[PDB]
Amino acid sequence: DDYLQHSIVPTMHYQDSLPRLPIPKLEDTMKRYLNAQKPLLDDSQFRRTEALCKNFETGVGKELHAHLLAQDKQNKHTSYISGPWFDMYLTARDSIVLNFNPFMAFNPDPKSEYNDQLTRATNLTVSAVRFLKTLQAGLLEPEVFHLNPSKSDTDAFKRLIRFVPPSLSWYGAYLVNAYPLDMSQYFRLFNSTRIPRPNRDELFTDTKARHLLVLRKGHFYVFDVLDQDGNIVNPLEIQAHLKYILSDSSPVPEFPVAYLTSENRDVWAELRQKLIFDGNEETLKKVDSAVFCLCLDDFPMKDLIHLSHTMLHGDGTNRWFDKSFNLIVAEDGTAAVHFEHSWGDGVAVLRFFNEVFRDSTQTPAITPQSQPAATNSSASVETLSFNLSGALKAGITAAKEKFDTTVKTLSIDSIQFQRGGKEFLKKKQLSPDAVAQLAFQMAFLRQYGQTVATYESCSTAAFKHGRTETIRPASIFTKRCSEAFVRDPSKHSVGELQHMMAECSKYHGQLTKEAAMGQGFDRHLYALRYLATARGLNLPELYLDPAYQQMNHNILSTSTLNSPAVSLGGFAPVVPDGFGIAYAVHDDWIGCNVSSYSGRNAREFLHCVQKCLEDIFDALEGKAIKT
């Protein structure tokens, strides 16, 4: 059939009974905030922040917290954090390009010839539309985190849980140590876009739409991928339509409209309104409502640096940055998902990506020898036409200049540390994630001689309308261990270094477990701030502390994925003097893809990460570290 999964448990079976997202005790949040500040602040600064924390906890913060809890109890259908979190990103006026939108790139199809561009674009597109149908049918398996897959991720369990009413279903999974996740964001994968508006942007969906949007050379094309009965269009007709688009000989437009999606959101909100005034609403609606955006690039990937730039931003002409996601396929079949971050936390995107990689490579719709259907693509494929005023043309020109100037400041590079990975580290009783994070702390100390604000995300999707929480990897323990390796390597025995690493790992594990339970401090403190502002109050003194601003100016911004579908991922720094560190610890190696703007040096950072990983592995092997 046209489905890529056949779940007997309805996709949304657990949604009604997911547990509510906890709100920490204010005393715990203040202690955790201070614990994270300890490595970052000098003694004098820390004493000042400590004093503000004491005043907050006894005064205005106590009152905000009381009100936050009361509000939560009146809004039990949701979480305390989801609204405030959406609001932050939808209100943000900065360009979504670099600041927010990341990418993940697919591994190639393991069969060489299936990486032909037309072939792969067809197969990925068909798999994506199969995913859409499977999700909409309730045939996608529920998202569930298992502690023991052997007992809980079984046909036996699934045959039983399907009979348990959704009001009690979560409890059935809980009984077998499995944790269903929130899936309320998943629908915005398709037929969805972000619309620029004054004050706060809109998330738009039109589930009735049946067409794909394709960008090539900055031109916009639409054609149906679902027929009037809801069935997938013949893959050989889809192939014909993509071949038609690939065969088009029009050069890049004088004023490529896609540039506008990279602008400041107020600038783009105004220009979109002008497009509407100039008669383009119907055309914009076709763009906005398409199942997703497929981007066909006409060049091959030169290397991983070029790949990263291409998938993270491109040249500004051939991505519709506002779309829920852009599926990009280059001339050598290299493919990736670039996605808009405001509509969710990316778990939906990773699920999509994983299922699409599996389906497209294991049961491809077409082969490299498939013959396109003899179809009237000139009728079935509409080339969209925008009516551009002088103001719009000038707007596109200004958007292009801004884009080109910004991209010029961005550097990206990677390493592949070959000495070992998860297997070695687990044998040494360490958390691989903790070791990677330690290496980044150590590298930054080596390079810049400082300990800085560091961000790692953790999912809180085990809870109703759960989002993410911040794990703060820069700890008293990583600071201590980094100082030992970098500044006083001769002062410590290998056993002493090993104990320090074990401590780093334990503490990182503790923070990880806590964050997954909603017991970080970042979201709680943000919610209290948001509440004060929403109620029309002046910002409490806690938040005017330079230390609070520093905690949230994330110089080391990190992110990881663990998936056999993912070749690599990437994102730009979140601050001008930051790094954007995409990493993955594989069984036998460690990968790092790091971005920087002019104010930092990614190449030097990566040389430092390599060296730090060498020293960590040496120390774990009992070797004296190399000076």
Short mmCIF file of all heavy atoms in Angstrom, two decimals, residues 256-294:
data_model
loop_
_atom_site.label_atom_id
_atom_site.label_comp_id
_atom_site.label_asym_id
_atom_site.label_seq_id
_atom_site.Cartn_x
_atom_site.Cartn_y
_atom_site.Cartn_z
N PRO A 256 14.97 36.96 -7.46
CA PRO A 256 14.50 35.71 -6.86
C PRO A 256 13.73 35.97 -5.56
O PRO A 256 14.28 36.51 -4.59
CB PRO A 256 15.79 34.92 -6.63
CG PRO A 256 16.80 35.56 -7.53
CD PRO A 256 16.44 37.00 -7.46
N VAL A 257 12.46 35.57 -5.56
CA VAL A 257 11.56 35.94 -4.47
C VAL A 257 11.96 35.26 -3.14
O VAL A 257 11.74 35.82 -2.07
CB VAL A 257 10.08 35.65 -4.84
CG1 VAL A 257 9.13 36.00 -3.70
CG2 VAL A 257 9.71 36.43 -6.14
N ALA A 258 12.61 34.10 -3.23
CA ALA A 258 12.94 33.35 -2.02
C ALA A 258 13.85 34.12 -1.06
O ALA A 258 13.88 33.84 0.15
CB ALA A 258 13.57 32.03 -2.38
N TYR A 259 14.61 35.08 -1.58
CA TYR A 259 15.47 35.91 -0.73
C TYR A 259 14.68 36.55 0.40
O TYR A 259 15.21 36.75 1.49
CB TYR A 259 16.12 37.03 -1.54
CG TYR A 259 17.40 36.70 -2.26
CD1 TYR A 259 17.48 36.83 -3.65
CD2 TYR A 259 18.54 36.33 -1.58
CE1 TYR A 259 18.65 36.55 -4.32
CE2 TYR A 259 19.72 36.06 -2.24
CZ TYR A 259 19.77 36.17 -3.62
OH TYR A 259 20.93 35.91 -4.30
N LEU A 260 13.43 36.92 0.14
CA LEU A 260 12.63 37.60 1.14
C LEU A 260 12.45 36.82 2.43
O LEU A 260 12.34 37.44 3.49
CB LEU A 260 11.26 37.98 0.57
CG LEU A 260 11.36 39.00 -0.57
CD1 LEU A 260 10.00 39.24 -1.17
CD2 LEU A 260 11.95 40.29 -0.07
N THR A 261 12.45 35.49 2.34
CA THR A 261 12.24 34.66 3.53
C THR A 261 13.45 34.70 4.48
O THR A 261 13.37 34.19 5.59
CB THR A 261 11.88 33.20 3.20
OG1 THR A 261 12.93 32.61 2.43
CG2 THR A 261 10.59 33.12 2.42
N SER A 262 14.55 35.32 4.05
CA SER A 262 15.75 35.42 4.89
C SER A 262 15.83 36.77 5.62
O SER A 262 16.77 37.02 6.37
CB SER A 262 17.01 35.24 4.02
OG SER A 262 17.21 36.34 3.15
N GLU A 263 14.85 37.64 5.39
CA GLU A 263 14.90 38.98 5.99
C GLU A 263 14.53 39.02 7.45
O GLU A 263 13.95 38.09 8.00
CB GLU A 263 14.01 39.98 5.23
CG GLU A 263 14.74 40.85 4.25
CD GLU A 263 15.56 41.96 4.90
OE1 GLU A 263 15.66 42.04 6.15
OE2 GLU A 263 16.12 42.79 4.13
N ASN A 264 14.84 40.14 8.07
CA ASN A 264 14.25 40.50 9.34
C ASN A 264 12.73 40.35 9.24
O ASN A 264 12.14 40.59 8.17
CB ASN A 264 14.68 41.94 9.69
CG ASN A 264 13.87 42.55 10.79
OD1 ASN A 264 12.73 42.96 10.59
ND2 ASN A 264 14.47 42.64 11.97
N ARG A 265 12.11 39.88 10.31
CA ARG A 265 10.71 39.46 10.23
C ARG A 265 9.75 40.64 10.08
O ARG A 265 8.68 40.48 9.52
CB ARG A 265 10.31 38.61 11.44
CG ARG A 265 11.19 37.41 11.65
CD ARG A 265 11.32 36.50 10.44
NE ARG A 265 10.05 35.87 10.10
CZ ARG A 265 9.88 34.99 9.13
NH1 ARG A 265 10.90 34.66 8.35
NH2 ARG A 265 8.68 34.45 8.91
N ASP A 266 10.12 41.82 10.59
CA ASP A 266 9.29 43.02 10.38
C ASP A 266 9.41 43.51 8.94
O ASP A 266 8.40 43.93 8.35
CB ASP A 266 9.69 44.15 11.33
CG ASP A 266 9.18 43.94 12.74
OD1 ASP A 266 8.08 43.39 12.91
OD2 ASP A 266 9.88 44.37 13.68
N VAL A 267 10.62 43.46 8.40
CA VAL A 267 10.86 43.85 7.01
C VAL A 267 10.04 42.91 6.10
O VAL A 267 9.32 43.34 5.20
CB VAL A 267 12.36 43.84 6.65
CG1 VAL A 267 12.58 44.05 5.15
CG2 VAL A 267 13.09 44.89 7.46
N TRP A 268 10.16 41.62 6.34
CA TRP A 268 9.47 40.63 5.50
C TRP A 268 7.95 40.69 5.74
O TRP A 268 7.16 40.54 4.81
CB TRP A 268 10.10 39.25 5.73
CG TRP A 268 9.48 38.00 5.14
CD1 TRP A 268 9.52 36.77 5.71
CD2 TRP A 268 8.81 37.82 3.88
NE1 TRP A 268 8.90 35.84 4.92
CE2 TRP A 268 8.44 36.46 3.79
CE3 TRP A 268 8.46 38.67 2.84
CZ2 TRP A 268 7.76 35.93 2.69
CZ3 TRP A 268 7.77 38.14 1.75
CH2 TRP A 268 7.43 36.80 1.69
N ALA A 269 7.51 40.92 6.98
CA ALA A 269 6.07 41.08 7.22
C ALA A 269 5.49 42.20 6.36
O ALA A 269 4.42 42.03 5.75
CB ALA A 269 5.79 41.35 8.69
N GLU A 270 6.18 43.33 6.29
CA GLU A 270 5.72 44.45 5.45
C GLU A 270 5.75 44.12 3.95
O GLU A 270 4.80 44.43 3.22
CB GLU A 270 6.53 45.71 5.73
CG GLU A 270 6.05 46.96 5.01
CD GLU A 270 6.97 48.17 5.21
OE1 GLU A 270 7.91 48.10 6.03
OE2 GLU A 270 6.74 49.20 4.53
N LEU A 271 6.83 43.51 3.48
CA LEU A 271 6.95 43.19 2.06
C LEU A 271 5.93 42.13 1.63
O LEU A 271 5.44 42.19 0.51
CB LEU A 271 8.38 42.75 1.70
CG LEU A 271 9.44 43.86 1.74
CD1 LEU A 271 10.84 43.30 1.73
CD2 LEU A 271 9.25 44.81 0.56
N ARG A 272 5.62 41.17 2.50
CA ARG A 272 4.58 40.19 2.19
C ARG A 272 3.23 40.90 2.07
O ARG A 272 2.44 40.59 1.18
CB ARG A 272 4.50 39.08 3.24
CG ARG A 272 3.59 37.96 2.84
CD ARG A 272 3.46 36.93 3.93
NE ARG A 272 2.67 35.80 3.49
CZ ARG A 272 1.34 35.73 3.52
NH1 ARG A 272 0.60 36.75 3.95
NH2 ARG A 272 0.76 34.61 3.09
N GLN A 273 2.96 41.85 2.95
CA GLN A 273 1.71 42.61 2.84
C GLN A 273 1.65 43.33 1.50
O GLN A 273 0.60 43.36 0.86
CB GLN A 273 1.56 43.62 3.96
CG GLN A 273 1.25 42.99 5.31
CD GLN A 273 0.83 44.02 6.35
OE1 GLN A 273 -0.30 44.54 6.32
NE2 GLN A 273 1.74 44.32 7.28
N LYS A 274 2.77 43.91 1.08
CA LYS A 274 2.84 44.59 -0.23
C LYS A 274 2.62 43.59 -1.38
O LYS A 274 1.92 43.90 -2.36
CB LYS A 274 4.15 45.35 -0.38
CG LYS A 274 4.27 46.55 0.56
CD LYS A 274 5.56 47.32 0.37
CE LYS A 274 5.61 48.55 1.24
NZ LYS A 274 4.50 49.48 0.90
N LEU A 275 3.18 42.39 -1.27
CA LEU A 275 2.88 41.35 -2.26
C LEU A 275 1.36 41.09 -2.36
O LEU A 275 0.82 40.94 -3.46
CB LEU A 275 3.62 40.04 -1.95
CG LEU A 275 5.10 39.98 -2.29
CD1 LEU A 275 5.65 38.70 -1.67
CD2 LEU A 275 5.32 39.99 -3.80
N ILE A 276 0.69 41.05 -1.21
CA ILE A 276 -0.75 40.85 -1.17
C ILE A 276 -1.47 42.02 -1.86
O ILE A 276 -2.33 41.81 -2.70
CB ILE A 276 -1.27 40.66 0.29
CG1 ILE A 276 -0.73 39.36 0.90
CG2 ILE A 276 -2.79 40.71 0.33
CD1 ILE A 276 -1.29 38.11 0.36
N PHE A 277 -1.05 43.23 -1.55
CA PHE A 277 -1.66 44.42 -2.15
C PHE A 277 -1.51 44.45 -3.67
O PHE A 277 -2.36 44.97 -4.38
CB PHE A 277 -1.03 45.67 -1.57
CG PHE A 277 -1.20 45.81 -0.08
CD1 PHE A 277 -0.33 46.58 0.65
CD2 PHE A 277 -2.24 45.18 0.60
CE1 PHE A 277 -0.48 46.73 2.01
CE2 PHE A 277 -2.39 45.32 1.96
CZ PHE A 277 -1.51 46.10 2.67
N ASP A 278 -0.41 43.88 -4.14
CA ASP A 278 -0.13 43.80 -5.56
C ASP A 278 -0.68 42.55 -6.24
O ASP A 278 -0.25 42.22 -7.35
CB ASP A 278 1.37 43.92 -5.78
CG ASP A 278 1.91 45.30 -5.47
OD1 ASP A 278 1.18 46.31 -5.67
OD2 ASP A 278 3.07 45.39 -5.05
N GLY A 279 -1.62 41.86 -5.60
CA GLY A 279 -2.38 40.79 -6.22
C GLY A 279 -1.83 39.39 -6.10
O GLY A 279 -2.28 38.49 -6.80
N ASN A 280 -0.88 39.18 -5.19
CA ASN A 280 -0.20 37.89 -5.09
C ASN A 280 -0.71 36.93 -4.02
O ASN A 280 -0.07 35.92 -3.78
CB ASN A 280 1.30 38.10 -4.89
CG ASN A 280 1.95 38.81 -6.04
OD1 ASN A 280 2.15 38.22 -7.11
ND2 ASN A 280 2.30 40.07 -5.83
N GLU A 281 -1.86 37.20 -3.39
CA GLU A 281 -2.32 36.30 -2.33
C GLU A 281 -2.52 34.85 -2.78
O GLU A 281 -2.14 33.93 -2.08
CB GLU A 281 -3.60 36.82 -1.67
CG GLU A 281 -4.03 35.97 -0.46
CD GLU A 281 -4.73 36.77 0.64
OE1 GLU A 281 -5.30 37.84 0.36
OE2 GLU A 281 -4.68 36.32 1.81
N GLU A 282 -3.11 34.66 -3.96
CA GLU A 282 -3.40 33.30 -4.44
C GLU A 282 -2.10 32.51 -4.64
O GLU A 282 -2.01 31.34 -4.31
CB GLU A 282 -4.21 33.33 -5.74
CG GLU A 282 -4.56 31.93 -6.25
CD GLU A 282 -5.67 31.90 -7.28
OE1 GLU A 282 -6.09 32.98 -7.76
OE2 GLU A 282 -6.13 30.79 -7.61
N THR A 283 -1.10 33.18 -5.20
CA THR A 283 0.22 32.58 -5.42
C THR A 283 0.89 32.26 -4.08
O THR A 283 1.44 31.17 -3.88
CB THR A 283 1.07 33.53 -6.27
OG1 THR A 283 0.48 33.64 -7.58
CG2 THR A 283 2.49 33.01 -6.43
N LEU A 284 0.84 33.22 -3.16
CA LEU A 284 1.41 32.99 -1.83
C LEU A 284 0.74 31.84 -1.13
O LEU A 284 1.42 31.06 -0.44
CB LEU A 284 1.32 34.25 -0.96
CG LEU A 284 2.36 35.32 -1.28
CD1 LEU A 284 2.02 36.63 -0.58
CD2 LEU A 284 3.75 34.85 -0.87
N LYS A 285 -0.57 31.70 -1.30
CA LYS A 285 -1.29 30.59 -0.66
C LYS A 285 -0.83 29.24 -1.20
O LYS A 285 -0.73 28.28 -0.43
CB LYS A 285 -2.80 30.79 -0.79
CG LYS A 285 -3.63 30.18 0.32
CD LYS A 285 -4.67 31.18 0.85
CE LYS A 285 -5.74 30.50 1.72
NZ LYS A 285 -5.18 29.73 2.86
N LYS A 286 -0.52 29.14 -2.50
CA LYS A 286 0.02 27.90 -3.06
C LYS A 286 1.38 27.58 -2.45
O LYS A 286 1.68 26.42 -2.19
CB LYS A 286 0.12 27.96 -4.58
CG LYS A 286 -1.22 28.17 -5.25
CD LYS A 286 -1.06 28.40 -6.75
CE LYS A 286 -2.40 28.56 -7.43
NZ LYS A 286 -2.23 29.09 -8.80
N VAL A 287 2.21 28.59 -2.24
CA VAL A 287 3.50 28.39 -1.59
C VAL A 287 3.30 27.93 -0.15
O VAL A 287 3.89 26.95 0.30
CB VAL A 287 4.37 29.67 -1.62
CG1 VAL A 287 5.60 29.53 -0.72
CG2 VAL A 287 4.75 30.05 -3.04
N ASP A 288 2.48 28.66 0.58
CA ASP A 288 2.30 28.42 2.02
C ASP A 288 1.74 27.03 2.31
O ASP A 288 2.13 26.40 3.30
CB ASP A 288 1.33 29.45 2.60
CG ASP A 288 1.85 30.89 2.54
OD1 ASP A 288 3.05 31.13 2.33
OD2 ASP A 288 1.01 31.81 2.73
N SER A 289 0.82 26.55 1.47
CA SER A 289 0.06 25.35 1.79
C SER A 289 0.63 24.05 1.22
O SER A 289 0.11 22.98 1.49
CB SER A 289 -1.37 25.48 1.29
OG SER A 289 -1.37 25.68 -0.11
N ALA A 290 1.69 24.15 0.42
CA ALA A 290 2.28 22.96 -0.18
C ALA A 290 2.68 21.95 0.89
O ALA A 290 2.96 22.31 2.03
CB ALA A 290 3.47 23.36 -1.04
N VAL A 291 2.69 20.67 0.52
CA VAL A 291 2.96 19.61 1.49
C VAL A 291 4.30 19.86 2.19
O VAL A 291 4.41 19.70 3.42
CB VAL A 291 2.87 18.19 0.87
CG1 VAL A 291 1.40 17.84 0.52
CG2 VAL A 291 3.78 18.01 -0.31
N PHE A 292 5.29 20.26 1.40
CA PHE A 292 6.59 20.77 1.88
C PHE A 292 7.28 21.43 0.69
O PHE A 292 6.66 21.57 -0.37
CB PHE A 292 7.45 19.66 2.52
CG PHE A 292 7.69 18.47 1.63
CD1 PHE A 292 8.81 18.40 0.84
CD2 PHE A 292 6.81 17.39 1.63
CE1 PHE A 292 9.03 17.27 0.01
CE2 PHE A 292 7.04 16.30 0.81
CZ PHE A 292 8.15 16.25 0.01
N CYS A 293 8.53 21.86 0.84
CA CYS A 293 9.27 22.48 -0.27
C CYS A 293 10.42 21.56 -0.64
O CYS A 293 11.22 21.21 0.21
CB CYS A 293 9.83 23.84 0.14
SG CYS A 293 10.55 24.74 -1.26
N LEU A 294 10.46 21.14 -1.90
CA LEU A 294 11.57 20.34 -2.43
C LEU A 294 12.48 21.26 -3.21
O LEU A 294 12.02 21.96 -4.10
CB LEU A 294 11.06 19.26 -3.38
CG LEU A 294 12.13 18.48 -4.16
CD1 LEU A 294 12.94 17.62 -3.21
CD2 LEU A 294 11.50 17.58 -5.24
#
